Amino acid sequence: KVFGRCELAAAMKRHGLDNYRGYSLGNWVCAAKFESNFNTQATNRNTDGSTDYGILQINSRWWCNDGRTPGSRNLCNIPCSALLSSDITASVNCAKKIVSDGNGMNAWVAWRNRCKGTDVQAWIRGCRL
Ligand SMILES: [Cl-]
Ligand SMILES: [Cl-]
Ligand SMILES: [Cl-]
Ligand SMILES: [Cl-]
Ligand SMILES: [Cl-]
Ligand SMILES: [Cl-]
Ligand SMILES: [Cl-]
Structure with a gap:
């Protein structure tokens, strides 16, 4: 499944990643x-x-x-x-353990190199949620 930006935002929130x-x-x-x-x-x-x-x-x-x-x-x-499931539950549950492992979101090298320090709120801009 290829998510929309707001669609994925909504699924992440629904699975408790928002501010995790x-x-x-x-x-x-x-x-x-x-x-x-x-x-x-x-x-x-x-x-x-x-x-x-x-x-x-x-x-x-x-x-x-x-x-x-x-x-x-x-x-x-x-x-x-x-x-690889269209339902993101497993990926979210696992991401929760990864981000808890001591280095935060730096575990995702793309996050450190392309998201960290940027205007990350743009990603959820306009989303109902
Ligand atoms: Cl996008
Ligand atoms: Cl989902
Ligand atoms: Cl297995
Ligand atoms: Cl193996
Ligand atoms: Cl942290
Ligand atoms: Cl944000
Ligand atoms: Cl929306």
């Missing part, structure tokens, strides 16, 4: 924008043999099981395929 660990909804929308372009089925291979999955590009190195990332953990206790 102090990160406003715009931060999360901006992160999803640069990680997946709002596409739930986005997958990208890392040079180290791990893969990033879904709307927020969660890495198999730590967070989910894809059965092909030697020595990886599955800290969200989830198949990586569950992160």
